[PDB]
RNA sequence: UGCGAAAGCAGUUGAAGACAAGUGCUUGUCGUUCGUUAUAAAUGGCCUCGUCAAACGGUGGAGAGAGUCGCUAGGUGAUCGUCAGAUCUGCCUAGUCUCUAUACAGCGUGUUUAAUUGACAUGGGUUGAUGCGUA
């Protein structure tokens, strides 16, 4: 999963209503019908400027613009293509309020102006759904009325939810049937949730519930696949349809540090169990199922980025993992300028592989039993060691062995309690700082035998221990996770035969051929040639190591004169190798007249 | 019953005149066993080298597969065909390296070669015992 | 069984009985029924008796009776093999009886390896209980508490003839592992065939793997494919893990060696057989029988613990993910993820819970006082079990002694919620608990060396009627 | 008690190129008769009805071959110049043929004397004359005049329709099943033209580009049409009007093509395609048209055909050669007073309350060696192993069973040089094959350990061991070579 | 026996009592004990219910067999010999080429993914056992 660099769609006009960046998004309305996975067009309603359609690809361009007076605020806007009495047509429906005195519901039909209509709506138009199959425009008013109109804006049916001050309404299709659920605030932080099914009455109420403790003023809401997502005070609350029951609450520690009022948060969905969150100029791609931050991107050249809408992938059914989102970006400077920007999103495979280790959430052995049967303080120690004078070996070993009650200079099964990794990391830092040169404490010998030797210190350890033959030998035999690079570079630079054999054994045991083969390739050609010479002058793994060298060299690099010397040597070995074999197997594996003298 | 047996190594689904290249390329493309077999009948190593030298690299891969199935069915033809296999691997080494998958497309070679190589320690043990008794009575 | 006719010294036979006949009798006023006791000396760990009642008319089993027949890793309590003409693996000579009894008591008291844990499986579709008996599988219904079936899953001299004297030293193939796909239609078996003694090929064990299938109504598994020597020659298949439901719709499995190899097999409809789809190279010459394998529910990543190191392998690449390498204090026994988030890893000294999401160990519990060397490598696999919804369980057994050890044992179950934060429950039983595994409903079943499957889980007419019935 | 297990024949792991169920069925076209004809046989067709006699066009004559007898039963020699087709009508009553002169003659099949209708289609040669499958009356004709006239048997004087537009010779006509209106023609232009007879016609509805001269076009199914031209055959879909598949296994130019479906084979449908390279190969439409079998013939194959689906008797595969050779391959398919005395055996208990069956099914007779193992005749079971005309696989078992039973030394005690020779002679041959190499290695070691002294005093055995010692050595060399190749491969990868 | 990999790495097989046999001594034995992690061999081998013929469906195949002085590559013999070669128009092995009921092995066709039928009175007696066929 990754976030593409945003690319500008258009520059927002300099209007007073749009001067408020915090409320700027509410004034920009995106049509649901035209912005999806497979569409290349975006229809947008910019309050006080126009309602405009843009083509995204190959390059952003403006295709159509309907001017609106500056004094009007676009409350709802929706556009869908279809066939109307048959001609291919595009139906545009937008709702405007002028000073709250009058509400306008307008319908525009374009030949793919064939007709334009307008009526006075009873209240603020919040959501509009255009049914091209039935040629019906369905508008949701803030006073709870659901009015069904034809393309001529003739009212056909009107349904009231019995509640006013509606604040959220969303359309969704399930199994071929259209639905809508509406959230209405009540007093004492109570919310009326009602589910409606669209079909004698075309509208049927399926569920109605009252939700307690659900605040709107500081809550950002979005919905995806029967799940309603609420962001509030850095906690994401997941409610599930049809009954809008709370399933899970996700604490997002990054948002908990935000001072209330200065940070601009926008929250939209992008795929299954995956949402997009923006905090000022930083963008996050979150996996809510596993609680992981898939991808983070910072837009240094914009003060704030606000989401408007995103095209959502049905990843369980769609092989596409790439989608697009639209938001408002505001630049830095004394005269800030807002721009519409599109971001391409790679959601990923919706799989645990993507989320592993990227969680946005931030040990002492315990006896298994608290209480006639057969049995078969790290900080204090660190402080004591830290107080020691530099190059004081005897005190260092005395404190470490005596405090921890360590009996052997090498790790054993009886020292499991010491296996807390941090204490080892600190002690290793202590050993390095206190001691340098040719004399190191016997503690290091114990740590080198410790199976949990830190990976952070494994690098260059052979170089550090290069001075002392004994410690170096100890590292090879038991020091875990020694980098193969250092072993190999040391393997072909040593001339000592004994260290060569063991390094071979160690390299072979802990690494596969495929990993070793690549590293040998990076090496210089002289060194392999030098190693090859030592051969011609427990041998099992050493030969097998040479076979690895030969393959990494490849066909082209090998030289004939050197090859023949090898060709002779290996033949001698095979003749011997055969010879011992029959030796080994061998270890595992009357006359009519005859003359005789009596014994009397 | 009729259950299929198998083994772990079946990695199946994971310059001079007289050269017989022209007949060979056709025989492999059309899978003409009889025509192919006349080509394999010649044994002159100089001819073997020249044929494989001019054979198109793409066809060489199926040639190895075709030789592979011949060897597996008919053990006695191991010797004569192995020179073909050895030469195909030598000349077209570079191309074979740059192939997306080898185990699947040369599974039959690996299956055939692995079966023989496994037998080696057992046969050496048989050989040693025979030399023990043969030396014994020849001396006696 | 031989019926000797003493009038003419002739005989009639009833051969190929399930075991050697410890006892015979004629039970009836007219000898209607013959009552037999059978032993099944194949299972040397335990004395597996089976009681037969045959109808004398046609010599056919009128009533066959036997308890559950597990195979423990070692002999238990005071079991002694029967008396034979020679001392062999499966029998004791005249002299060897007393000495073997003494050695058995001394082994149970003095020695420290006390692993009697036995492999068992639970069938998803039917919830019958599958016992890998020597060279056979015994299917037992614990809801009804009876055996339903007994099928020979190997070649070998199984029931072709009764082994006697030297033939008794032969070792039939042994079913080391037996596992079912999640869908429950496919049965995977892993078998080791032992060559006879005193031949050239008397040290090359043969590793076989087999795939069987059956419909729900049928009662006999049918062998569908057979792999001889998977992963190479003489290289064991230490572990089998059937695939999760996501990948190939539960028609696949993973097999792991002692050399670090992973082989992923799948069912190909076009071929109509199982075929080796993916492979990892077991080439490095590090050998260890201690290997752990777990698969995430999604099927994307695989956890392979070999010796003291755990590796995260992507399923798509079948290679290390691009931290995947985790070192442990000692060799891993069991790797399991209780839920998609948490991975529970047991080493020989401790057990630990790790968050894959955070990559930080949460809880660690010390096991060394109880599990030090009593269990061989890989049997902790069968002692520990994990539910798919609630949490896991750890089973810890210990010898009771008063004033040197005594043969009697005491077991303790510990229910752990996910990530081992809290102990949901603690329980103690009075006998060695051999195996505890998760039945697919909420409850857990466990097996005792007494072969007892316990479960841990959440008017004149009225007189006239009587007189008529009496008559 | 349990019935005795049957000894399990050994099965070594499957080797490449195993026999497939498709091949097993097609190998049963065994009986081969080669007939010679005066000139190249150009076209072959099968009567759709019983007994499905097939007609072959050669030179100036048409010959009908009986299905059972496989010999000529009727001969049509009235044609003055060469003849170019012998398709039957759907009913099978009529036979239509063309001439170089261009006339099209319709004869009553099985009555060569009578001529029913004679049509002067065109002055140019008339290569293809096919009846319409759905409709009996309408007859189609294709000429080198490049117009595929649609004739009617009732009215012969003028064509019902005259399709045109082809810029080269038309030699291929196909009628799509379930769409009788549609007609498919192929020209050497490289275009397959599809026409609709319901419309006015004379202009193709659309053309499919084949890029090489089209030699034959066959409608495999109502939505798929396969056309063989040039060095490949490509299957097209009309709904999409694009090629689903193409196969280029052939070397020479495909010439003829035939299709058969729903016959008793494992493979539901078969597509046989002539090659002109002497090959005629079978493709499977259910498997993306992959090859499954092939035959080779002496010369180029100019016509192929297979017996229809409802053969109702021995099947036939027929191929035609330019040399005139015709190749046929066939898949062959007391007293009353006594009876009244015993009349009950027929009854199967249909009217009875209770049906009780206890008879055990008859098992296949067990071979001699199995009888000896079951009776514990170890030594004899070894002798039966090495008998003349004993299949190799069966012999390998009775060695394995005895080893598995643990009876190897027991089977070799009472033996001398006279009776040991057969075992070594097999071993002399078994050592070569990979499967028996391990087993022979085992037995050979034992007889040495058990007959060392006997070997010294017997000269014949000494030779057997020298010869054995030679071949075991030769096997070492082969195995050693295989290892070097195996190492050689690992270097490449 | 312990550990381990399967390979192996280390370590064992002691003492008492009693009986039998041969001649207090010698050897062998233990339904006797203590302690240590710690050849066999009493002539002695697995039941009956239904057989035979002919098909059909999958699974394997070293294919089961007969020819070709037709090619390719080897190995090698008898007698003579002026050592260059001769006659046996030499022999054997392998590959190839031609052909046949795939001719060969095996599991099933009580329902299975697929795939069957037919014959018989499954009895008693008499002759031949130097049986019948073949060299």
Swiss-Prot record, chain A:
A Pfam family the protein falls into: Utp8_b_propeller
Main subcellular location: nucleus
Coiled coil (UniProt feature): none
Top-level taxon of the source organism: Eukaryota
GO molecular function: tRNA binding; U3 snoRNA binding
Compartments, record wording: Nucleus, Nucleolus
GO terms under biological process: maturation of SSU-rRNA; maturation of SSU-rRNA from tricistronic rRNA transcript (SSU-rRNA, 5.8S rRNA, LSU-rRNA); positive regulation of transcription by RNA polymerase I; tRNA export from nucleus
Keywords for this protein: Nucleus, Phosphoprotein, Ribonucleoprotein, Ribosome biogenesis, rRNA processing, Transcription
GO cellular component terms listed in the entry, alphabetical order: 90S preribosome; nucleolus; rDNA heterochromatin; small-subunit processome; t-UTP complex
The keyword Nucleus appears for this protein: yes
General remark: Present with 16800 molecules/cell in log phase SD medium.
The protein's assembly and partners: Interacts with snoRNA U3. Interacts with MPP10 and UTP25. Component of the ribosomal small subunit (SSU) processome composed of at least 40 protein subunits and snoRNA U3. In the absence of snoRNA3, forms a complex with other t-UTPs. This complex can associate with pre-18S ribosomal RNAs.
Role summary: Involved in nucleolar processing of pre-18S ribosomal RNA. Also has a role in nuclear tRNA export. It acts between the steps of tRNA maturation/aminoacylation and its subsequent translocation out of the nucleus. Required for optimal pre-ribosomal RNA transcription by RNA polymerase I together with a subset of U3 proteins required for transcription (t-UTPs).
Protein name: U3 small nucleolar RNA-associated protein 8
Gene that this polypeptide is encoded by: UTP8
From Swiss-Prot, chain B:
Comment field (misc): Present with 33100 molecules/cell in log phase SD medium.
Protein name as catalogued: U3 small nucleolar RNA-associated protein 5
Residues of the full protein shown: 359 to 557 of 643
Location(s), subcellular: Nucleus, Nucleolus
Lineage, highest ranks first: Eukaryota, Fungi, Dikarya, Ascomycota, Saccharomycotina
Family: Belongs to the UTP5 family.
Disulfide bond entries: none
Residue spans of the WD repeats: 54-94
Physiological role: Involved in nucleolar processing of pre-18S ribosomal RNA. Required for optimal pre-ribosomal RNA transcription by RNA polymerase I together with a subset of U3 proteins required for transcription (t-UTPs).
Subunit text: Interacts with snoRNA U3. Interacts with MPP10. Component of the ribosomal small subunit (SSU) processome composed of at least 40 protein subunits and snoRNA U3. In the absence of snoRNA3, forms a complex with other t-UTPs. This complex can associate with pre-18S ribosomal RNAs.
Swiss-Prot record, chain C:
Coiled coil: none
One GO biological process term: maturation of SSU-rRNA
Miscellaneous comment text of the record: Present with 6560 molecules/cell in log phase SD medium.
Function of the protein: Involved in nucleolar processing of pre-18S ribosomal RNA. Required for optimal pre-ribosomal RNA transcription by RNA polymerase I together with a subset of U3 proteins required for transcription (t-UTPs).
Compartments in which it is found: Nucleus, Nucleolus
GO molecular function: mRNA binding; RNA binding; U3 snoRNA binding
Subunit structure: Interacts with snoRNA U3. Interacts with MPP10. Component of the ribosomal small subunit (SSU) processome composed of at least 40 protein subunits and snoRNA U3. In the absence of snoRNA3, forms a complex with other t-UTPs. This complex can associate with pre-18S ribosomal RNAs.
Keywords for this protein: Nucleus, Repeat, Ribonucleoprotein, Ribosome biogenesis, rRNA processing, Transcription, WD repeat
One GO cellular component, as annotated: rDNA heterochromatin
WD repeats: 170-222, 232-275, 285-322
The protein, known as: NET1-associated nuclear protein 1
UniProtKB/Swiss-Prot annotation, chain D:
Keywords: Nucleus, Repeat, Ribonucleoprotein, Ribosome biogenesis, rRNA processing, Transcription, WD repeat
GO molecular function, one term: U3 snoRNA binding
Compartment list: Nucleus, Nucleolus
Matching Pfam families: UTP15_C (PF09384), WD40 (PF00400)
InterPro entries: U3_snoRNA-assocProt_15_C, WD40/YVTN_repeat-like_dom_sf, WD40_repeat_CS, WD40_repeat_dom_sf, WD40_rpt
GO biological process, one term: maturation of SSU-rRNA from tricistronic rRNA transcript (SSU-rRNA, 5.8S rRNA, LSU-rRNA)
One Gene Ontology CC term in the entry: nucleoplasm
WD repeats: 36-77, 78-117, 123-161, 165-205, 209-246, 249-293
Subunit structure: Interacts with snoRNA U3. Interacts with MPP10. Component of the ribosomal small subunit (SSU) processome composed of at least 40 protein subunits and snoRNA U3. In the absence of snoRNA3, forms a complex with other t-UTPs. This complex can associate with pre-18S ribosomal RNAs.
Protein's job: Involved in nucleolar processing of pre-18S ribosomal RNA. Required for optimal pre-ribosomal RNA transcription by RNA polymerase I together with a subset of U3 proteins required for transcription (t-UTPs).
Note: Present with 358 molecules/cell in log phase SD medium.
Protein name: U3 small nucleolar RNA-associated protein 15
Lineage: Eukaryota, Fungi, Dikarya, Ascomycota, Saccharomycotina
